[PDB]
Amino acid sequence: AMLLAPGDVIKRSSEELKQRQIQINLIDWTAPIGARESAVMLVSNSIKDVVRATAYFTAPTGDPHWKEVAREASKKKNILAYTSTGGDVKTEFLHLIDHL
Amino acid sequence: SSDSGPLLSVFALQEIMQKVRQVQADYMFTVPDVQKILDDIKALAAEQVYKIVKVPSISFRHIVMQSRDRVLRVDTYYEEMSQVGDVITEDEPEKFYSTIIKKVRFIRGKGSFILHDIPTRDHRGMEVAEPEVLGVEFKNVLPVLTAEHRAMIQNALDGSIIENGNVATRDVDVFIGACSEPVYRIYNRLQGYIEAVQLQELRNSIGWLERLGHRKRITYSQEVLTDFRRQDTIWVLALQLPVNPQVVWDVPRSSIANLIMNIATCLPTGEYIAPNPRISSITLTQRITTTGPFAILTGSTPTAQQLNDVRKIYLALMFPGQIILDLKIDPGERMDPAVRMVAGVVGHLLFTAGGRFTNLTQNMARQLDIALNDYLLYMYNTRVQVNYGPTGEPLDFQIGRNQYDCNVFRADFATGTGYNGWATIDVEYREPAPYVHAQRYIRYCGIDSRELINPTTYGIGMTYHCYNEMLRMLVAAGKDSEAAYFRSMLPFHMVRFARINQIINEDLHSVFSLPDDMFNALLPDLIAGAHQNADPVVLDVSWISLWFAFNRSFEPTHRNEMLEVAPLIESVYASELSVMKVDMRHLSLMQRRFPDVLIQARPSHFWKAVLNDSPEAVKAVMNLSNIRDMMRWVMLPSLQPSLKLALEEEAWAAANDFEDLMLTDQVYMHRDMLPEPRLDDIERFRQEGFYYTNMLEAPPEIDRVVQYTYEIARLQANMGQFRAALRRIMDDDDWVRFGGVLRTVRVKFYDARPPDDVLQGLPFSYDTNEAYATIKYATETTIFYLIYNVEFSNTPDSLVLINPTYTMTKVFINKRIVERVRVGQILAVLNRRFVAYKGKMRIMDITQSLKM
Amino acid sequence: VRMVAGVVGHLLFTAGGRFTNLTQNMARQLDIALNDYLLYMYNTRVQVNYGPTGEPLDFQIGRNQYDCNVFRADFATGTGYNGWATIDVEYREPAPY
């Protein structure tokens, strides 16, 4: 399961995802112990990995590369989508990753 | 790192190659790229057999004579087929059989065509055929005819109406055309097969494909399951999906090739994932007490050979019986005992021993059990009371507060006790699988693979027998820390076994897997130590590689991108094998039928000949490693039906005769002066031309001909009495025939004086060396038809000679290659029935629907 | 999403009885998805008893061993969809057409 999110929220929340043992491939712009903690394989945002993603998350942000990625993700026939509704994106994004 | 299909395939093939060369070197290369071979076999599967064409190729043509009432009609098929092949020579059997197979392949390939959207014309409210669709060419005779004969030919040409007919409740248009005999036979057989396939087996093939897709949890496209029932499409079935699996498992010495093909075609791609770091925190807490063996685990970056060992041990874990494991001898590196005992316990957990199947030898079990004995005896933080047994074998002592023993822990292949196969069930036969040879189900952990799993929640609250028993053993031994570590380990362990069970019971199901016979017989083969079938494959690993394998795991990221197109590849492979077998059988029968006129040849000769004219992809797939063994292979009547096999059989039946192959042994020598053209009295030459040929209307009188064979001719040549005997025969005004070995012939047409080599040609070559001289039978004999153009009459020396000239060679062919007819009979040969489909109909196959 | 789509489409549409609006391919895919959803086996533990043949949904689940093989689609009676044993077409006073 792969997810697409804006670059700023991934860069700002890198340490929590690293604690979640989720791989990160970012492009900059300047209960007993279980087998695994989260089901997500990769959270990133690029043109190359849109063909492998299965969902995407949209939020108000600023970056010159989110437009094409979001449009190509919306082009997909069979993909899930989530949107942010007010407040902080911190807890909402963390909860979505936890229950994905 | 990542592991995929082709990468692990070439890795395992490299290990197989290095092991086999190490084995072979005791008795006094690079791995081929599997991607290139696989692309070739996919492309060959995508190739078509037939050919769609608007109009059939021309079959007859006409040459006008000087007389206006006579035309000469010639079939172009013999003319264009006599030029196909090579020279026939008596002392090269391989060239002879190569020419024969090339000619029969050409005959088969020429006649395979399907009509589509033929041109038409409206006349008197009906449909009529435009002159180019029917195979008659008469361009030359139209300007030279009279008015009323032109009226006759126009009426006859316009009288070819078009009738309507049905083919499996589909509308078709049928008309009358002209074509040669074997080409029409091949076309009619193809049309008959097309009509016959529409009834029964195509629906069965579609249903079998749907069932196979249902088993493997993949859904096929709507086209391949729906366009069967469409009214406007005709579906021809070149390759039948329910392929018989005996043919692929019958070629000798192919277990490695089938295994590597299965790995290349069915393995998905995945990632290796480290366990939960809270377990690492537990290990760090354990590090306070240094008495633990894994406190000195040295969790550094593994080297390359350790990664290779992990990959090969997981490969051994995937295949239950194909791959066996052993230990690598390392007398150079010095090792601590802690790694030895942790490797021993890890190997006890992760592997299996026996019961129904096995993947280990007795040796590695022996070192494993002695290492576990060393762990339970040598190292200790404090002493624990223990009572030893009377017999001096490992694991024969009672240790702990209770009366718990370890005699049952001893490795035994009869019952498979101690390991994960202790009193569990592994093999199970439930429901007839889509493949009728691999109806088995296996379960390493003991949990079914039908139910889905979720990694974040699975693995809590359930245990199996062997793990619980050893945990009770270890807690009875007083080793609490290792017990807690393994309790942490357990969910990861069961998740990995669930994943491996799913991938082995769901994805690797193919024709290339072993059937139940040798799968069941493998264990007694290893127990008895005597090999009768194909031997198993053994590999080697290191001690710490076991710990690395236990720490790591394999989780698939996504499936192979070509899992859906494998059945077509296996079907076309089996069809090519069947074509090879039927070709071998037909060559043997052809050799046996006529031994007097054909030379005897070794099996290797025409075997190499038939291999030379075969596609390269099946050559590469087959040869991934005698003479009589493949003869025994050919003797088995196992077979796989296909369209190509039917066409090959029909072509062989047509080519059973030699007269239609333009190969004959009827050549004659007779002395007769060449007729001369009447140069004088120019008006007569203008109103009457010249015409000469070699062919006789009938064989000559039987009593006035003598017979020579190869042996007596060779003897006379050795004794130097050949030409004298020929002269003596010739002056008697008799005939002579060069019977015996088959001869190739050619046909040519000349509008002027032919070169002197053709006119003075001899049916033998005579040379001298300095046992007197050598003779060879004719390289080629030419059949010529001389029709001198009267336009050349104003320019002589192109139609006249200087002396009376004697021609010698005559050839008799029973079939009328060239005939003379008047204007009435030039359109009387239209007697063949042609069926066609409209261009508003679509022709589609299964391969085209899958976008190959 | 395929699993939940199958389990919801087994209830949304209708099949069999007097008419249908699905092909057999959709019926088979929906049955497969329903079987996959019923065998997801996520949180609690429940016993399942499989049947003789390998046809989908041929098993019994629950403490009372409920028969769930009748949910398999069949166009003769439509027992696995909205047309299952319910009157669905009727007649009344004549229409103008």
Any CB–CB contact under 8 A between C58 and chain B?
no
Any CB–CB contact under 8 A between B272 and chain A?
no
Nearest chain A CA: its distance from B379 CA (Å): 29
Q: How many Å apart are CA B831 and CA B851, to the nearest integer?
A: 41
- Two tokens, residue B323: 């791959």
Sequence-distant (≥ 6) Cβ neighbours of residue B797 within 8 angstroms: none
Interface with B, mutate which of A36, A38, A78 (most B CBs under 10 A): A36
Residue B835 CB neighbour total at 10 angstroms: 18
Q: How many CA atoms lie within 13 A of A23 on its CB side?
A: 10
- Residues of C in Cβ contact (< 8 Å) with B450: 39
3-class SS of residue B607: helix
Interface with A, mutate which of B460, B493, B551, B554 (most A CBs under 10 A): B460
Spatial CA neighbour of B212 closest among B500, B436, B547, B548: B436
Q: How many Å apart are CA B707 and CA B737, to the nearest integer?
A: 6
- Two tokens, residue A2: 């792969």
Q: How many Å apart are CA B89 and CA B86, to the nearest integer?
A: 9
Q: How many Å apart are CA A17 and CA B687, to the nearest integer?
A: 104
Terminal alpha carbon distance of chain A: 8
- Where are the strands (E) in B18-170, listed by range? 52-53, 60-64, 70-75, 114-115, 120-123, 126-129, 163-166
- What is Dmax (Cα atoms) for chain A? 44
Interface with A, mutate which of B271, B276, B561 (most A CBs under 10 A): B276
Q: State which amino acid sits at residue A75.
A: K
**Residue labelled with tokens 């055309």:** B177
Spatial CA neighbour of B847 closest among B229, B238, B102: B238
3-class SS of residue B23: helix
8 Å CB contact of A36 and B273: yes
**Closest Cα in chain B to A33:** B488
Q: How many Å apart are CA B725 and CA B716, to the nearest integer?
A: 9
Q: State which amino acid sits at residue B799.
A: L
Spatial CA neighbour of B763 closest among B797, B738, B728: B738
**Closest Cα in chain B to C54:** B431
Q: How many Å apart are CA B119 and CA B544, to the nearest integer?
A: 77
Q: How many Å apart are CA B246 and CA B636, to the nearest integer?
A: 10
Nearest CB to C25: which of B225, B452, B454?
B225
Q: How many Å apart are CA B238 and CA B252, to the nearest integer?
A: 27
φ, ψ for residue B305, nearest 5 deg: -65, -30
Spatial CA neighbour of B178 closest among B849, B758, B834: B834
- Residues of B in Cβ contact (< 8 Å) with C44: none
Residue B565 CB neighbour total at 10 angstroms: 17
- Two tokens, residue B737: 């025939």
Residue B569 CB neighbour total at 10 angstroms: 22
- Where are the strands (E) in chain A, listed by range? 2-4, 23-25, 42-44, 55-58, 80-83
Q: Can you list the alpha helix ranges (DSSP code H) found in B140-200? A: 147-158, 181-197
Determine contact, residues B449/B502, Cβ cutoff 8 Å: yes
Q: How many Å apart are CA A38 and CA B777, to the nearest integer?
A: 84
φ, ψ for residue B420, nearest 5 deg: -70, -15
Nearest chain B CA: its distance from A65 CA (Å): 27
Spatial CA neighbour of B110 closest among B745, B655, B657, B747: B655
Any CB–CB contact under 8 A between B337 and chain A?
no
Residue B1 CB neighbour total at 10 angstroms: 8
Q: How many Å apart are CA B345 and CA B360, to the nearest integer?
A: 15
CA dihedral of B160, B164, B167, B172, whole degrees rounded to 10: 70
Spatial CA neighbour of B615 closest among B247, B105, B94: B105
Q: State which amino acid sits at residue A5.
A: A
Interface with B, mutate which of A19, A21, A23, A33 (most B CBs under 10 A): A33
CA C56 to chain CA centroid, nearest Å: 11
Q: How many Å apart are CA B736 and CA B742, to the nearest integer?
A: 16
Terminal alpha carbon distance of chain B: 31
Strand order in B832-836's β-sheet? B163-166, B171-177, B832-836
Q: How many Å apart are CA B578 and CA B572, to the nearest integer?
A: 10
Q: How many Å apart are CA B347 and CA B364, to the nearest integer?
A: 9
CA angle A24, B502, B7 (to 5 degrees): 55
Any CB–CB contact under 8 A between B226 and chain C?
yes
Determine contact, residues B705/B667, Cβ cutoff 8 Å: no
Spatial CA neighbour of B741 closest among B760, B761, B763: B763
Q: How many Å apart are CA C70 and CA B819, to the nearest integer?
A: 76
Helix (H) or strand (E) holding A71: helix A66-75
Task: Provide the sign of the torsion angle of the four alpha carbons B444, B446, B451, B454, taken in this order.
Answer: negative
Nearest chain A CA: its distance from B536 CA (Å): 35
CB pairs below 8 Å between B and C: how many? 30
- Two tokens, residue B651: 């072509």
Q: What is the resolution of the experimental data for this entry, in Å?
A: 3.5
Query: How far apart, in Å, are the Cα atoms of A55 and each of A60, A93, B312, B557, C7?
Result: 17, 13, 35, 16, 21
The DSSP output letter for B274 is -
- DSSP per-residue string spanning B210-249: HHHHHHTT-PPPHHHHHTTS-TTEEE--SS-SS--TTTTT
Q: What share of chain A is helix, strand, coil (3-state, %, to 5)?
A: 35, 15, 45
Query: How far apart, in Å, are the Cα atoms of B292 and each of B338, B379, B467?
Result: 9, 9, 20
CA B549 to chain CA centroid, nearest Å: 39
3-class SS of residue B114: strand
Helix (H) or strand (E) holding B172: strand B171-177
φ, ψ for residue B542, nearest 5 deg: -105, 170
Q: State which amino acid sits at residue B195.
A: E
- Two tokens, residue B177: 């055309």
Nearest CB to B457: which of C36, C39, C42?
C42
Interface with B, mutate which of C25, C34, C53 (most B CBs under 10 A): C25
Name beta bridge partners: B670: none
φ, ψ for residue B74, nearest 5 deg: -130, 135
Q: How many Å apart are CA B665 and CA B663, to the nearest integer?
A: 7
Q: Can you list the alpha helix ranges (DSSP code H) found in B623-700? A: 628-635, 643-654, 682-687
Query: How far apart, in Å, are the Cα atoms of B177 and each of B57, B135, B650?
Result: 11, 7, 22
Spatial CA neighbour of B59 closest among B180, B218, B236, B182: B180
**Closest Cα in chain A to B492:** A35
Determine contact, residues B256/B624, Cβ cutoff 8 Å: yes
- Two tokens, residue A21: 């043992």
Strand order in B705-708's β-sheet? B705-708, B735-738, B667-673, B806-811
**Closest Cα in chain C to B433:** C54
- Residues of B in Cβ contact (< 8 Å) with A32: 460, 491
Q: Which chains touch C (3 or more CB pairs under 8 A)?
A: B
The DSSP output letter for B364 is H
Any CB–CB contact under 8 A between C25 and chain B?
yes
Q: How many Å apart are CA B645 and CA B583, to the nearest integer?
A: 9
- DSSP per-residue string spanning B426-491: -EE--S--SSTT---EE-SSS--SSS---TTTTTSS---HHHHHHHHHHHHTT-HHHHHHHHHHHH
Q: How many CA atoms lie within 13 A of C41 on its CB side?
A: 18
The DSSP output letter for B273 is -
Q: What share of chain B is helix, strand, coil (3-state, %, to 5)?
A: 40, 15, 45
Residue A9 CB neighbour total at 10 angstroms: 17
- Two tokens, residue B497: 């076994």
- Two tokens, residue B433: 């699988």
- Residues of C in Cβ contact (< 8 Å) with B222: 25
Determine contact, residues B460/A34, Cβ cutoff 8 Å: yes
Any CB–CB contact under 8 A between B430 and chain C?
yes
Method used to determine the 3D structure? cryo-EM
Residue B383 CB neighbour total at 10 angstroms: 7
**Residue labelled with tokens 């395929």:** C2
- Two tokens, residue B552: 């790591």
Determine contact, residues B458/B498, Cβ cutoff 8 Å: yes
Query: How far apart, in Å, are the Cα atoms of B144 and each of B62, B64, B67, B818?
Result: 13, 8, 10, 21
φ, ψ for residue B674, nearest 5 deg: -70, 130
Residue A58 CB neighbour total at 10 angstroms: 16
Any CB–CB contact under 8 A between C29 and chain B?
yes
Determine contact, residues B411/B353, Cβ cutoff 8 Å: yes
**Residue labelled with tokens 């196992």:** B638
The DSSP output letter for B834 is E
Sequence-distant (≥ 6) Cβ neighbours of residue B218 within 8 angstroms: B559, B563, B564
- DSSP per-residue string spanning chain C: -HHHHHHHHHHHS--STT--SS-HHHHHHHHHHHHHHHT---SS---EEE-SS--TT-EEETTTTEE-GGGS--TTT-TTSTTSS-------SPP--
Task: Provide the sign of the torsion angle of the four alpha carbons C70, C75, C77, C79, taken in this order.
Answer: positive
| Count of all residues that appear for chain C in the document | 97
Determine contact, residues B444/B420, Cβ cutoff 8 Å: yes
- Two tokens, residue C66: 């409920």
Spatial CA neighbour of B634 closest among B244, B253, B247, B245: B247
- Two tokens, residue B732: 């008697």
Q: How many Å apart are CA B768 and CA B774, to the nearest integer?
A: 6
Determine contact, residues B328/B541, Cβ cutoff 8 Å: yes
φ, ψ for residue A4, nearest 5 deg: -115, 130
Q: How many CA atoms lie within 13 A of A53 on its CB side?
A: 26
- Two tokens, residue B720: 């130097």
Determine contact, residues B809/B667, Cβ cutoff 8 Å: yes
CA angle B194, B199, B200 (to 5 degrees): 115
Q: How many Å apart are CA B411 and CA B290, to the nearest integer?
A: 31
Q: How many Å apart are CA A52 and CA B597, to the nearest integer?
A: 68
Determine contact, residues B768/B740, Cβ cutoff 8 Å: no
Determine contact, residues A89/A57, Cβ cutoff 8 Å: no
Report CA Rg, chain A. 13
**Residue labelled with tokens 């493997």:** B216
**Closest Cα in chain A to B278:** A33
Residue B659 CB neighbour total at 10 angstroms: 11
Report CA Rg, chain C. 16
Any CB–CB contact under 8 A between B454 and chain A?
yes
Any CB–CB contact under 8 A between B214 and chain C?
yes
**Closest Cα in chain A to B555:** A41
Spatial CA neighbour of B544 closest among B407, B725, B344: B344
- Residues of A in Cβ contact (< 8 Å) with B488: 33
- Residues of A in Cβ contact (< 8 Å) with B276: 33-37
Q: How many Å apart are CA B677 and CA B689, to the nearest integer?
A: 8
Determine contact, residues A75/A49, Cβ cutoff 8 Å: no
The DSSP output letter for B136 is B
8 Å CB contact of B276 and A35: yes
Q: How many Å apart are CA B473 and CA B395, to the nearest integer?
A: 12
